[PDB]
Design a protein around this nucleic acid. Structure first.
Length: 65
DNA sequence: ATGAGACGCTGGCGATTAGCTAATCGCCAGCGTCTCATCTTTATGCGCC
């Protein structure tokens, strides 16, 4: 429910789009199932750059952590 | 062929004799703990019909 509004904006993307269903499961298995609690900075640095390899992330759904 | 009818110091004292709420104020109020769990609810932090 908290990951249904974590919106991802690619550096090449033209409009913000919420994370897709497979993307959510990817987030869960990579980070949300490894650490007790994941900060937004940690999700941005430890998932998007390792999987999507996006230069920068832009979250419009959760603040600080 | 006579013998009834016509009735007092009290009031103003003392002095017994007896008896009763009420107005003012002050005091002073059972309290001590812990455990255990149980749920809520609030402050801040995130979303558009």
């Amino acid at each position: 429910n908290e990951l249904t509004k974590v919106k991802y904006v690619t550096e090449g993307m033209r409009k913000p789009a919420f994370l897709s269903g497979e993307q959510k499961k990817a987030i869960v298995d990579l980070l949300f199932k490894t650490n007790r609690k994941v900060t937004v900075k940690q999700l941005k640095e430890d998932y998007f750059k390792k999987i999507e390899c996006f230069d920068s992330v832009e979250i419009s759904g959760v603040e600080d952590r």
